[PDB]
Amino acid sequence: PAPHGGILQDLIARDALKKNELLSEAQSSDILVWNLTPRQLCDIELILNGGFSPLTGFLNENDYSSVVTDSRLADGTLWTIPITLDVDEAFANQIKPDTRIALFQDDEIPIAILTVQDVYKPNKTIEAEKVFRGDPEHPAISYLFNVAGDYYVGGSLEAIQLPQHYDYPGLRKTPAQLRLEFQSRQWDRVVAFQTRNPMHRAHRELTVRAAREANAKVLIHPVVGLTKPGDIDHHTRVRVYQEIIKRYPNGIAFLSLLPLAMRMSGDREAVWHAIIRKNYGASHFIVGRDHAGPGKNSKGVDFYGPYDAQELVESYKHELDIEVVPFRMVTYLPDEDRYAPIDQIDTTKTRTLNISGTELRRRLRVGGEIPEWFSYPEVVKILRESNPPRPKQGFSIVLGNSLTVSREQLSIALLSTFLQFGGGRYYKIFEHNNKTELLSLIQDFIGSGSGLIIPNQWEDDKDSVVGKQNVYLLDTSSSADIQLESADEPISHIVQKVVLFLEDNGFFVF
Amino acid sequence: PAPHGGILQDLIARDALKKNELLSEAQSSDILVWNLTPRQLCDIELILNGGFSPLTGFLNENDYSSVVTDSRLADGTLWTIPITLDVDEAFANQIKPDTRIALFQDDEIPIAILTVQDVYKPNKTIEAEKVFRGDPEHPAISYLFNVAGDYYVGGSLEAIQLPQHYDYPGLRKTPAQLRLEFQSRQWDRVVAFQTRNPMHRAHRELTVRAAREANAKVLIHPVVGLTKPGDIDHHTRVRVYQEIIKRYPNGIAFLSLLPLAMRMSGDREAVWHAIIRKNYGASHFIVGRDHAGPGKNSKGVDFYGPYDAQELVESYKHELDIEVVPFRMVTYLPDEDRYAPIDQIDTTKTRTLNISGTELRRRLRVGGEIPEWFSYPEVVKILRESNPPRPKQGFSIVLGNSLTVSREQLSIALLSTFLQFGGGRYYKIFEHNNKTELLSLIQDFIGSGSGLIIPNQWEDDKDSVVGKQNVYLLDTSSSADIQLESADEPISHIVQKVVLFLEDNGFFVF
Ligand SMILES: [Ca+2]
Ligand SMILES: [Ca+2]
Ligand SMILES: [Ca+2]
Ligand SMILES: [Ca+2]
Ligand SMILES: [Ca+2]
Ligand SMILES: [Ca+2]
Ligand SMILES: [Mg+2]
Ligand SMILES: [Mg+2]
Ligand code: NA
Ligand code: NA
Ligand code: NA
Ligand code: NA
Ligand code: NA
Ligand code: NA
């Protein structure tokens, strides 16, 4: 269907003949520069390539306010997620309306020139409540307060070039490009599938049934910008998509990556996804259970109800101009060797099997088997590689502050001991000297599968620098992972405690 | 580089706003229609999509003659293979210059309107000698005399649509389309690889080295129109390409299909391939040993010298405007587990292994093993499927005219006997009654793996209707595949002769 607002605002194409001129202005000595944050790069790419039609810049306060309370742009155009350029006070003060500023990437690549319409300090409590529902634990609110700038700069954009990406150049289709790809194949009915996760047999099955019921071709449009915190990296995920797309019948599916920065804003985001896919050329879209929802908070309560998304999108059905296909999740029937829509089988009368994310995570952590009815083997092989089991995981042993035995000798004892065991893990007694440049290397070593022995703890005002994954404290204190019987426990006893701890946790296997 | 002649003659785009008008004219009652032959569909698709720039129609006699003797269009543009619309006398007579005729596909799909410039009867002996070197066994000369019409119609083309194809819609990129695909990936150095065969490890290796030496991305551009007689079907081949393209390092290669009708015209064709790839957007091209050559004739003599192609292309180097990368064939070194350029190793000092086409064919016929150093397993699996070994091959036993035993009983005996054996082959006593509609089904059954028992021979004026592959004559005559001791040999003896013959030939395995 036609782009939201009727026109594809592909600013790259619009400004093609001003590229040199704009590029030269961006590189002028007198122009004020702003370095785009990683989320802003995600947003500006979608504005510049028309992914966010009718947007043609970051929202000024007039539009922003309507989006916050009315879920629309001041002109009444449905638009549920505010896209603004958040800056700090120091920069906001240097700019006034009509000021033209340059937006760079990595402090070296000019992306666009923004003509300032306004500068304002939004009430983040209202946005937090109105747009994201108010739970301080909602990733969007966390970002809203802890990362986002306190001042929004609204203004019209002029394009120099889209944010630079060196990976998957072939798959990052812009709206215009994707539309031409469909057009060259004569596809005029396309159902799009959103995801920020690996795809298993069930996803393959459900998307194909969608294709069959909507009489449409399939578009697997995964998000590769910012997704939920803790999600699997997009490189791993792209590898999985590239693998699963080969499992569809020839000529029925197309894989294209979307550099979107999700807010995990549930029902509002679901609407936004529909609009965005319409701009990219899809005729149909599937909205899932708790679509774009971040789940439950600490108190175990739902950030959104499982059907809020589908209900909200349905309420805007008459103006979305993109058909929404009903979400029919499928489950595996052992006794019939097939998948079937969950709404068609009687739980208490028919056998069904499925592997929850929690269980999948466990199996991967212990190197256990994962059945082909759940996920294709080539897909599982990829997941095991990016997330190796414990015998292949790195780790660190931190000699606590309470230790009175010789740190130099205990570290040497641990090294010599670990080195006896096989498995190929690399070991290092690592001294950081409380230097940040060294502390930041700890998780890289662990990520590399290495075993580090750290002679002493770093200062508390440095915790933030070190990731806590697979990092274990050896100390007399109660908060120690490997508790010492006493501060002067004999080195050989300590060594045993560590070895058996690592064994119990799967790092060593004999 | 720029299209040959400087302009991409994409007539589909040129005539976009006349499509309805032209379509309506093509469907008029008074317009004279011509049904395009399968080769003409191959040629018109390349003319219409700019693949043959600067051509904009089929060659008139003025241009055709220059191509025949001068290897150029009358304007002096390098062009080595004549592309003409060959028709029979009955049609040629109905047309005069300025006559507008419609060119259809399958007698139902209008492709273009041709404005006749001239009608002429070419001297096919000169073309045969000058363009194709004169050997009556050259596939182009065979076609030239036995299939091609005796009258050439020269004229300008106007596009309605490209020849319809329902398979691989995604991979059939036109010149403009491919150029945009390279442009979107920022590829400006692309080396193209021509082929009408399956690709094995050696081809993968040599194309990647080409990429490394030319500092270019790779374009695997296989021909899927008409290639050499006896070649493997393009469906099988496309399956292989789609498989091998996955073996290149990510982002280095692109697969696009070329609907060219090869003439197997060696050095002239090599030049033509360079021009064509330049039009499709390649900056580089590899010309191989005996490139586009059909091999040797009956007397075992070479249709072309192995380096005629490379030498001819090199002589036109200063006007081709596309770099030709030297052809460095590679061979496998067992002792080093690697492939290396054949021009770098000493045959008598270093071990090298390779599997000729003949040997590959044998292994496939007997279901023998084919090593991974030769071809990737997923590629070999595909070849085995399209070309199954003898235990999975169909066949036919024809009861010769010399037989005096009861044909009804011998056929029944053979059936009952074959049915004892396992293997899943399907059997049928097939009566054709000398009817063409039934005879043409024989190879379909054999192609399906079936075993047919044919009670009597068909008339000689029908031989042509039946393919001779895996068809065996049971007769007393000397020209019989399974020779009877006598015309009245006992049925049980005959049955044994047939069973043991089929066993010796691998159809049955116990
Ligand atoms: Ca703040
Ligand atoms: Ca719930
Ligand atoms: Ca003590
Ligand atoms: Ca003739
Ligand atoms: Ca030779
Ligand atoms: Ca007798
Ligand atoms: Mg980009
Ligand atoms: Mg076509
Ligand atoms: Na519409
Ligand atoms: Na999913
Ligand atoms: Na609710
Ligand atoms: Na040039
Ligand atoms: Na080849
Ligand atoms: Na020669």
A402 and A491 in one domain? yes
**Are A169 and B184 an interchain contact pair (Cβ–Cβ within 8 Å)?**
yes
Question: CA-to-CA distance for B17 and A295, rounded, in angstroms?
Answer: 53
Q: Is A197 a catalytic residue?
A: yes
Place of tokens 């050896």: A474
Q: Does B249 touch chain A (CB under 8 A)?
A: no
Query: How far out from the chain centre does Cα B417 lie?
Result: 40
Q: What CATH number is given to the structural domain containing B147? A: 3.10.400.10
Contacts of B257 in chain A (CB under 8 A): none
Ligand 7 center to A45 CA (angstroms): 6
Cα–ligand 10 centroid distance for A206 (angstroms): 10
> Would residue B196 show up in a list of annotated catalytic residues for this protein?
yes
What is the DSSP-derived secondary structure letter of residue A273? H
Nearest ligand to the C-alpha atom of residue B195: 13
Q: Are residues B370 and B399 in the same domain?
A: no
B434 phi-psi bin (left φ>0, alpha ψ -120 to 50, beta other): left
Contacts of A254 in chain B (CB under 8 A): 170
Determine the distance in angstroms separating the CA of A275 from the nearest CA of chain B, rounded to an integer. 24
B170 and A CB contact within 8 Å? yes
- Specify burial of residue B215 (Cβ count, 10 A radius: 0-12, 13-18, 19+): exposed
Q: How far apart are the CA of A410 and the nearest CA of chain B, in angstroms?
A: 46
Q: How many CB pairs under 8 A join A and B?
A: 23
Q: Which residues of A touch B184 (CB under 8 A)?
A: 169-170, 173, 177
Which three-class secondary structure state does DSSP give residue A318? helix
Of the CA atoms within 13 Å of residue B244, those in its CB half-sphere come to 31
Helix%, strand%, coil% for chain A, nearest 5: 40, 20, 45
Are residue B173 and residue B216 in the same domain, yes or no? Answer: no
| Chain B residues touching A186 at Cβ < 8 A | 169
Could you tell me which residues come within 8 angstroms of residue B13 by beta carbon, excluding any fewer than 6 positions away? B176
Tokens for A102, please give them: 């340059």
Question: How far apart, in whole angstroms, are the C-alpha atoms of residue B440 and residue B457?
Answer: 14
- CA-based nearest residue to A8, from A168, A176, A147, A156: A176
Beta bridge partners of B101: B32, B114
Q: Which ligand is nearest to the CA of A305?
A: 11
DSSP H or E run through B105: strand B100-105
Sign, CA dihedral B260-B263-B267-B269, equals negative
CA–CA separation, B21 vs B44, rounded Å?
Answer: 20
**Residues B286 and B327: beta-carbon distance below 8 Å:** yes
Residue B162's nearest CA partner among B175, B179, B180 is B175
Spatial distance between the Cα atoms of B449 and A426, rounded to a whole number of angstroms: 57
**Do A212 and A196 belong to one domain?**
yes
Could you tell me which residues are beta bridge partners of residue B34?
Answer: B103
Residue A163 exposed, middle or buried by CB count within 10 Å (0-12, 13-18, 19+) = buried
Residues of A in contact with B251 (CB under 8 A): 168-170
Helix then strand then coil, % of chain B, to nearest 5: 40, 20, 45
Task: Tell me which residue range forms the domain holding B173.
Answer: 1-188
Q: Are B112 and B159 in contact (CB under 8 A)?
A: yes
Among positive and negative, which fits the CA dihedral A25, A27, A32, A37?
Answer: positive
Q: Find out whether B14 is annotated in a ligand binding site.
A: no
Phi, psi torsion values for A337, nearest 5 degrees:
55, 50
Residues B336 and B4: their CA atoms lie apart, in Å, by 44
CA distance B83 to B9: 15
- For residues B100 and B21, the answer to whether their CB atoms sit within 8 Å is no
Residues A334 and A358 both lie in one domain: yes
Same-domain status, A193 and A152: no
Last residue in a domain, options A338, A370, A388:
A388
Candidate list A99, A197, A350, A434, residue with the active-site label = A197
Which chain A residue has the Cα nearest residue B243?
Answer: A246
The partner residues of A339 in beta bridges, in order of sequence, read: A332
Say how many C-beta atoms besides its own lie within 10 A of residue B46's C-beta: 25
Contact status, residue B85 vs residue B99, Cβ threshold 8 Å: no
The Cα of B181 is separated from the nearest Cα of chain A by a number of Å equal to: 8
Q: Is B102 strand, coil or helix?
A: strand
Chain A residues inside the 8 Å CB shell of B170: 184-185, 251, 254
Give the H/E segment covering residue A415: helix A407-418
B251 in A contact zone (CB under 8 Å): yes
Do residues B137 and B79 touch, judged by C-beta distance below 8 A? no
Give a three-class secondary structure readout of A245-270.
HHHCCCCCEEECCECCECCCCHHHHH
CB A184 to CB B168 under 8 A?
Answer: no
Q: Do A169 and B180 touch (CB under 8 A)?
A: no
Helix ranges (DSSP H) in B147-265: 175-184, 201-214, 234-244
Phi, psi of B385, deg, nearest 5: -65, -45
Which residues of A line the annotated binding site for ATP?
194-197, 288-291, 330
- CA–CA dist B505, B499 (Å, integer): 10
Neighbours of B173 (CB within 10 A): 21
Query: Is the CB of B251 less than 8 angstroms away from the CB of A177?
Result: no
Of B72, B48, B51, B49, the closest CA to residue B62 belongs to B72
Closest CA to A390 of A510, A509, A507: A507
Q: Enumerate residues 6+ apart whose C-beta is below 8 A from A61.
A: A118, A120, A122, A152, A154
Q: What token pair was written down for A477? A: 């204190």
B262 and B330 part of one domain:
yes
Q: Tell me how far CA of residue B144 lies from CA of B134, B263, B430, in angstroms.
A: 11, 10, 37
Between the CA of residue A325 and those of A315, A321, B148, what are the distances in Å?
14, 13, 53
Which of A169, A180, A185 is opposite residue B169, by nearest beta carbon?
A185
Chain centroid to Cα A353, Å, comes to 28
Question: What secondary structure does DSSP assign to A23-49, as a single string?
Answer: HHHHT-SSSEEEEPPHHHHHHHHHHHB
Residues 6+ apart with CB under 8 A from B342: B328, B329, B330, B331, B352
B509 touching chain A per CB within 8 A: no
Ligand 3 centre and the CA of A410: distance in Å? 16
Are A264 and A340 members of one domain? yes
Beta-carbon count within 10 A of B222 CB: 23
Q: Which ligand is nearest to the CA of A302?
A: 2
- Please check whether residues B169 and B222 belong to one and the same domain: no
List the catalytic residue out of A196, A237, A263, A268.
A196
**Domain check: are B121 and B181 in the same one?**
yes
**B310-to-B156, B221, B307 alpha-carbon distances in Å:** 33, 19, 5
Last residue of a domain, one of A362, A388, A414: A388
Give just the sign of the alpha carbon dihedral A483, A485, A488, A489: negative
Our count of domains for chain B comes to 3
Q: Is B395 exposed, middle or buried (0-12, 13-18, 19+ CB in 10 A)?
A: buried
Tell me the CATH number at B497.
3.40.50.300
B195 is catalytic: yes
**Any chain A CB within 8 A of the CB of B422?**
no
Same domain, A358 and A493: no
Indicate if the alpha-carbon torsion angle B67, B71, B73, B78 is positive or negative.
positive
Which DSSP letter does residue B344 get?
G
**What is the spatial distance between Cα B405 and Cα B463, in angstroms, rounded to a whole number?**
24
**Structure token pair of residue B216:** 């270019």
Question: Residue A251 and residue B169: Cβ atoms within 8 Å?
Answer: yes
Residues B210 and B252 in one domain: yes
The neighbour count for residue A459, using CB atoms within 10 Å, is: 9
HSE at residue B380, side-chain half, CA atoms within 13 A, is 19
CB atoms near residue A470 (< 10 Å): 18
Residue B73 carries which DSSP code? Answer: -
Domain with B352 in it: what CATH number? 3.40.50.620
How far away, in angstroms, is B469 Cα from ligand 4 center?
29
Is residue B195 annotated as involved in ligand binding? yes
CB atoms within 10 A of CB B425: 19
**3-state secondary structure at position B345:** coil
Q: Residues followed by a break in chain A, C–N over 2.5 Å?
A: none
Among residues A343, A369, A388, which one ends one of the domains? A388
> Do A486 and A477 contact (CB within 8 A), yes or no?
no
Q: What is the DSSP string of A51-95?
A: TTTT--EE--HHHHHHHHHHSB-TT--B--S---EEE-HHHHHT-
Mutate to test the interface with A, among B174, B180, B182, B184 (most CBs of A within 10 A): B184
List the alpha helices (DSSP H) in A245-373: 266-279, 308-315, 317-320, 357-366
CA A354 – CA A338 distance, rounded (Å): 12
Check CB contact of B186 with chain A, cutoff 8 Å: yes
Residue B380 · residue B355 · CB < 8 Å: no
CB contact under 8 A, A180 and B180: yes
User: Which whole-number Å values give the CA distances from B278 to A479, B5, B175, B253, B281, in the listed order?
Assistant: 70, 11, 9, 17, 5
Say if residues A217 and A190 touch (Cβ distance below 8 Å).
Answer: yes
Determine whether the interchain pair A177/B169 forms a contact, defined as Cβ–Cβ distance below 8 Å. Answer: no
Query: In whole angstroms, what is the distance from residue B365 CA to residue B384 CA?
Result: 9
Q: Give the separation between CA B138 and CA B360, rounded to whole angstroms.
A: 25
Distance from CA of A169 to the nearest CA of B (A): 5
Report the alpha-carbon distance of residue A328 to residue A207 in Å, rounded. Answer: 9
